[PDB]
């Protein structure tokens, strides 16, 4: 009937002084 | 009980002093 | 009853100093 | 009292934020 | 009736001292 | 008549044998 | 007249009452 | 009268004609 | 020298009462 | 004699009584 | 003179005890 | 030259341990 | 001295194409 | 001598016979 | 602290006497 | 203080007398 | 100091008389 | 005080009597 469930991902990374290629490649959405 | 759907993604990265090439390639699904 | 769906992604990346250093490609299906 | 259903993308990267000093491509199919 | 289901996923990594490639390749979706 | 289940998941990598920067290739979603 | 490779996709859905939330998006680029 | 290899997708939803609500997008690029 | 090699999928959804927001996100490759 | 190979996937789904998100996300193409 | 029959796959999903989101994500192709 | 016949597959999903409704994420094809 | 970064794809195939009506499509985002 | 990273894709194929029917799709996304 | 690394892929294949329909489909980019 | 890294992939295959369907599907880029 | 990290990969295969489907579906890049 | 050398990898394969199956579905990248 009624249910509440969300995702929770926290990705934290240290890498100061420029990483070898900073890029975000994501497929987000699909279902509202 | 209320039906609630959400997503939480936090991507944090330290890359201070200008990155080589910061680029975002993302597809946000157009579904409501 | 109330029905609310959602999505939320926060991308945080440090990299000050770069001039004109940002390339973004965002594509949305049909209707958010 | 009103149901809500929309996406939230916070693309935060240190890469200038003055005037048109970046490459941004936004595509939406028919209706947002 | 009543149904709540969530989980905290946290990833922390230190890779300082020398650049090493920062890229997010991810599929976030599937169902509400 | 009540069913709620969650768990805390956290991973931290510091002072490892050899860097890694930040490469995330993952499929996260599919189901609620 | 020998038959050759044709595509076959039948998407049948009983969705009478087609209002605000009914969207069809077809993307191709090459040959038909 | 000659058999050939071509695409064939039947998208049938009960409520054809598309009116003040649903959105249909046909996109190709090459030859029909 | 002629053979019949192709994919075939029929996706059928019954007499629902019209969903919150039904959508066909389809990419048909321009190949032959 | 003649070499013929073909796919055939029938997906029948029921979701009556109250809307719940109906989505066809498919990639059909690439090769003949 | 080699002859090979094709495969057949059928999948039927009823409403069940209680509706739950009908979404099909499929990659169809690969070769011919 | 020996004749080869493929196997047939049929599946019905209903009255299981936990309602699924209709969630299919698959790679169908590969060769031929 | 000076750093160098450029694309290099040698598509060599005995199967050229620009003729009476072949299909060639070359496209870019914003800047190179 | 000084040298830096670059792409190098050599696609070599013997394919004579192929005429009045070639299709090429090349796209770039991400200032190079 | 200079990085000297290039890509190198050599794809060699025979396909003489006209292919069913020679197609080159690729994305060349990913800002250096 | 010199660091060099590279990859060499040579894929060689015979397919004479016209292949069923010769196609190159390649994603080349992903910030070097 | 001086460091080397690479490997030679060579693959040769005989498939004369038309292969099932001379197709390259490959992802090369991501980050370098 | 760590040093790694490269290796030579060669693979040769025959497969007549029954087509080999020349389709490359791979991913080479991830990290430098």
Swiss-Prot record, chains A, B, C, D, E, F, G, H, I, J, K, L, M, N, O, P, Q, R:
Binding of Cu(2+) 2, residues: 2, 5-6
Portion of the full-length sequence here: 680 to 711 of 770
Record's subunit section: Interacts with S100A9.
Gene assigned in the entry: APP
Outcome reported for the amino acid change (mutating residue 2 to F): 60-70% zinc-induced amyloid-beta protein 28 aggregation
Protein's cellular compartments: Cell surface
Glycosylated residue positions: 2
Site (Cleavage): 8-9, 11-12
Site (Implicated in free radical propagation): residue numbering on this chain: 25
Name of the protein this chain belongs to: Amyloid-beta protein 40
Effect of mutating residue 14 to Q: In CAA-APP; Dutch type
Site (Susceptible to oxidation): 27
Interaction with PSEN1: region residues: 16-32
Binding site for Zn(2+) 2: 2, 5-6
């Amino acid at each position: 009937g009624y249910e509440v469930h969300h995702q929770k991902l926290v990705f934290f990374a240290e890498d100061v002084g420029s990483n070898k290629g900073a890029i975000i490649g994501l497929m987000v959405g699909g279902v509202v």
